[PDB]
Write a protein that binds this ligand. Structure first.
Ligand SMILES: [Zn+2]
Ligand SMILES: [Zn+2]
Length: 59
């Protein structure tokens, strides 16, 4: 249903619905449990708590 995503003044980060499929924090390279934030706009599927550490602008 949710077609629009909170773009904001920077990264969009598309919440990866982990309802059966795992997620790998491309940033670090480990396994992600929580709704990993995947900024397909430039970055990738990063860890939820890691998103706060990523202060990069939307390339
Ligand atoms: Zn971005
Ligand atoms: Zn991480």
């Amino acid at each position: 249903p949710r077609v629009l995503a909170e773009r904001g003044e920077g990264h969009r980060f598309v919440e990866l619905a982990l309802r059966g499929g795992p997620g790998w924090c491309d940033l670090c390279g480990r396994e992600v449990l929580r709704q990993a934030l995947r900024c397909a706009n430039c970055k990738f599927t990063c860890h939820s708590e890691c998103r706060s550490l990523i202060q990069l602008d939307c390339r």
